[PDB]
Design a binder for this molecule. Structure first.
Ligand SMILES: Fc1cccc(-n2ccnc2)c1
Length: 209
């Protein structure tokens, strides 16, 4: 049972600007998703300090980067706090509305596009490199869900029947044809070292066949 939703007009506008604007510095998408993963890991760690049972869904706090040339996907997995269905449909878009407006106005000041992360909308930078994004997520208080969007003004949410996650978020980037450099080990390594060197969680870059 797949539910289809319209993006807010302001978010659809942000996604169109990300997709259509000429901007060569696309590698910043990985810094933003890793930063999002680190934030989600901070949240479940802090919650576990007053309720150790919050880690019954998984004690390990980590980030995995998994490229797959056969599927042309780059997957960013974290074991953070995850996302509820209300997060996917409503809450995150609500925050992203004001952040988008501030991001556009900041751009007219002296801000750079690479500062998208300071406005709570760094997630949408995934569309610098992906033609489709699939997000599998599991929050302790909700079921496992699959969010998916190829932009174009709409996204879908469904209950996920696949392998159970325990807890956390998996962002699957279905890469554009000309963006396969982000499946290369040496390229991902270079980006993590340049932009994510001091993340306080183990980042494991998986290698392929
Ligand atoms: F996985 C998703 C689905 C929908 C929105 C978001 N998101 C995160 C930050 N701003 C927006 C993430």
């Amino acid at each position: 049972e797949v539910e289809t939703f319209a993006f807010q007009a302001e978010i659809a506008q942000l996604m169109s600007l990300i997709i259509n604007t000429f901007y060569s510095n696309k590698e910043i998408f990985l810094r933003e998703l890793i930063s999002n993963s680190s934030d989600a890991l901070d949240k479940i760690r802090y919650e576990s300090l007053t309720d150790p049972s919050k880690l019954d869904s998984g004690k390990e706090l980590h980030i995995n980067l998994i490229p797959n040339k056969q599927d042309r996907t780059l997957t960013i997995v974290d074991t953070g706090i995850g996302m509820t269905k209300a997060d996917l449909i409503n809450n995150l878009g609500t925050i992203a509305k004001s952040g988008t407006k501030a991001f556009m106005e900041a751009l007219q000041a002296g801000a750079d596009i690479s500062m998208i992360g300071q406005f709570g909308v760094g997630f949408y930078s995934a569309y610098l490199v992906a033609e489709k994004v699939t997000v599998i997520t599991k929050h302790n208080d909700d079921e496992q869900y699959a969010w998916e969007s190829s932009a174009g003004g709409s996204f879908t949410v469904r209950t996920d029947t696949g392998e159970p996650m325990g807890r956390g978020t998996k962002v699957i980037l279905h890469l554009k044809e000309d963006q396969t450099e982000y499946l290369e080990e040496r390229r991902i390594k270079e980006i993590v070292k340049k932009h994510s060197q001091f993340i306080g969680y183990p980042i494991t870059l998986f290698v392929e066949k």
